[PDB]
Design a protein around this ligand. Structure first.
Ligand SMILES: [Zn+2]
Ligand SMILES: [Zn+2]
Ligand SMILES: [Zn+2]
Ligand SMILES: [Zn+2]
Lengths: 172, 186, 200, 72
RNA sequence: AAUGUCUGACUGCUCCCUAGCAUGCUACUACCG
RNA sequence: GCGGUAGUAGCAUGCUAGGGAGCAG
């Protein structure tokens, strides 16, 4: 709804509302990433900051929403449930696609990463071991990062047709 | 539940059933690939079920033994955890009197009773050697717990009353090192 | 879960056939299992093939097929050897040091403590191996001289109520917490243990 | 802030009691008296002076080697 | 040499975990009519 | 082509029992 000087020819000036534009962007997948609107289109990806969370950053704004101040002061409306009626929560995981920690042969001949295995780190080495120690440390750090963000209060959501099997299938 | 030979069996069953429904076969052939695929599910559901049961069983066993180990190891070490917690709290408080007496005690000056509060009620202190006496008892006054005290009697380790002016740096070896001071509140 | 008693590098492994069950980094555990009679390692789970009856307790004969542990004749088509690359499949594999003179502990473990030379060996190593030799010497004493214990059950009664019987004439040890025995059921076949057992 | 005083007084009494001080009688009575007085105080200053009077007990004994924990 | 034991009332409601049984619901397979 | 019984698994509800906890007078 506020396009810059340039990128205006890219980013068309649009304010969203499910009272209108609900029927146009039907193709593909939207992406509301911290742009707080009304109920979202059924094929969206959103990271909306929760407001009832407490901390020392966010401050009691108005009205029934809070002012979230760390860099530039962001004001966000009151958290409501009727915004995600067309979406579902996002279960945690950890996709990845990269080479394997191969201190030698690249396939089946290089493991030496002793892990009691997870069930959701859909990495590239999930055979039996099952995480190239590379991906082991990467999964550890990414898990910590997800935890910290969600503790600082960010609630993700996804379209209801989401699945996890398909990434596994993409691996092969 | 993928890492199963029964998974390969069931997947071959699904693929063959798909071939039967996609090739336009006759009526009884799809019954062979429906009765076998359904016996295939009646075995695959079953083996995946039992394996997830054994898995969750091992998992709850793990959480139980973890709970036990944690609880016992903590119960072992209360006598020290409490002390370290107490002292970090005391340091975080940051008051003048508390820190005064803690530093006096880590040097060697400890009381011999409860520090009273009224202007009466005596107070006794142990002095280890005379330097701290310089840093503290100056004349008839006495500063302890950030409050003023009047010295009224001194004595060394062998219960000998020791005159005030008697003490000095020169005569210092002429006294038992652990002196004792009896003061009152100002 | 501990520190390699030789290397201090953090180990999740213990030496099974060894009397004290100590912590040895992947390299040190490797060295012990290739330089002594100790072929059993103890971690979160005991290292053995989990095929029915496959009593493969040799550390060098196990392969991680699927999620369970397997011998050669049992490993599914997806596996690899644990005892390989100079180290063992043990946690903290990268942060492993490998002691240079494992022969020290390799001799402290496979001795009998009846010869004075073993006492010289204990007196003539570093302080860590000194206290290790202390623990293992007291352990050799108690396992030999200080009291004893084999008993064969007569019949089961309930989940925690059991008829026993030692061997007539064999040292019948006291029944205390600091007295546990390796429970062996032999099918015919299958010299498999059922764990550690104290009685009262 | 005052809550911090009340809290550290609780912890201090716990330490004293686990150092077997309740074996002696009159001393334990005094310690309990000071603790229950601190828990009900309203202003910070007199609570602080009761706190120092009560800490003097732990300092008067040689069971806790403060020169160790005062290492920061 | 032991081992072992230390003060915890009467009620009411609620959550969590496990077990058992029956019942109830649904699917797969089998036999006979 | 149907019924029935028997099995097995899945799922639910309920009741009992066992254990852990919370609040109330
Ligand atoms: Zn990899
Ligand atoms: Zn080592
Ligand atoms: Zn050994
Ligand atoms: Zn085997």
């Amino acid at each position: 709804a506020q396009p810059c000087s340039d990128k205006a020819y890219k980013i068309e000036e649009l304010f969203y509302s499910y009272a209108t534009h609900s029927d146009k962007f039907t193709d593909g997948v939207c992406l509301f990433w911290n742009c707080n609107v009304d109920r979202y289109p059924a094929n969206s990806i959103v990271c909306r900051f929760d407001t009832r969370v407490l901390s020392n950053l966010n401050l009691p704004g108005c009205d029934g929403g809070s002012l979230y101040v760390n860099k530039h002061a962001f004001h966000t409306p009151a958290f409501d449930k009727s915004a995600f009626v067309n979406l579902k929560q996002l279960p945690f995981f950890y996709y990845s696609d990269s080479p394997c920690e191969s201190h030698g042969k690249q396939v089946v001949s290089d493991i030496d990463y002793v892990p009691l295995k997870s069930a959701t780190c859909i990495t590239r080495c999930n055979l039996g071991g099952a995480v190239c120690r590379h991906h082991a440390n990467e999964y550890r750090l990414y898990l910590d990062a997800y935890n910290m963000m969600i503790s600082a209060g960010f609630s993700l959501w996804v379209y209801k047709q989401f699945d996890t099997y398909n990434l596994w299938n993409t691996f092969t | 539940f993928s890492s199963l030979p029964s998974y390969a069996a069931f997947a071959t069953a699904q693929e063959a059933y798909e071939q039967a429904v996609a090739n336009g076969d006759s009526e009884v052939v799809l019954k062979k690939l429906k009765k076998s695929l359904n016996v295939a599910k009646s075995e695959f559901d079953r083996d995946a079920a039992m394996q997830r049961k054994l898995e969750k069983m091992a998992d709850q066993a793990m959480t139980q033994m973890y709970k036990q180990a944690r609880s016992e190891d903590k119960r072992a070490k209360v006598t020290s955890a409490m002390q370290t917690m107490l002292f970090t709290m005391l340091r975080k408080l940051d008051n003048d009197a508390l820190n005064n007496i803690i530093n006096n005690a880590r040097d060697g000056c400890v009381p011999l009773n409860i520090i009273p509060l009224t202007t009466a009620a005596k107070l006794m202190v142990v002095i280890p050697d005379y330097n701290t006496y310089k840093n503290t008892c100056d004349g008839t006054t006495f500063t302890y717990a950030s409050a003023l005290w009047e010295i009224q009697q001194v004595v060394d380790a062998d219960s000998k009353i020791v005159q005030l002016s008697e003490i000095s740096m020169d005569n210092s070896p002429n006294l038992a090192w652990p002196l004792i001071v009896t003061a009152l509140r100002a | 879960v501990g520190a390699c008693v030789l290397c201090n590098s953090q180990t999740s492994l213990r030496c099974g056939a060894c009397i004290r069950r100590p912590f040895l980094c992947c390299k040190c555990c490797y060295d012990h299992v290739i330089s002594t009679s100790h072929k059993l390692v103890l971690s979160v789970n005991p290292y053995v093939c989990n095929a029915p009856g496959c009593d493969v307790t040799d550390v060098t004969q196990l392969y991680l097929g699927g999620m369970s542990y397997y011998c050669k004749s049992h490993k599914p088509p997806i596996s690899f050897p644990l005892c390989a690359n100079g180290q063992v499949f043990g946690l903290y594999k990268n942060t492993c040091v490998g002691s240079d003179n494992v022969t020290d502990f390799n001799a402290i473990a496979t001795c009998d403590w009846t010869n004075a030379g073993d006492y010289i060996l204990a007196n003539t190593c570093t302080e860590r191996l000194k206290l290790f030799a202390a623990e293992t010497l007291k352990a050799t004493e108690e396992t030999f001289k200080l009291s004893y214990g084999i008993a064969t059950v007569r019949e089961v009664l309930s989940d925690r109520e059991l008829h026993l019987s030692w061997e007539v004439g064999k040292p019948r040890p006291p029944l205390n917490r600091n007295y546990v025995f390796t429970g062996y059921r032999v099918t015919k076949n299958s010299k498999v243990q059922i764990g550690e057992y104290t009685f009262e | 802030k005052m809550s911090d005083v009340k809290c550290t007084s609780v912890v201090l009494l716990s330490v004293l009691q686990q150092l077997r001080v309740e074996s002696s009688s009159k001393l334990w009575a005094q310690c309990v008296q000071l603790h229950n007085d601190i828990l009900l105080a309203k202003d910070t200053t007199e609570a602080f002076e009761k706190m120092v009077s009560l800490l003097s007990v732990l300092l008067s004994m040689q069971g806790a080697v403060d020169i160790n924990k005062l290492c920061e």
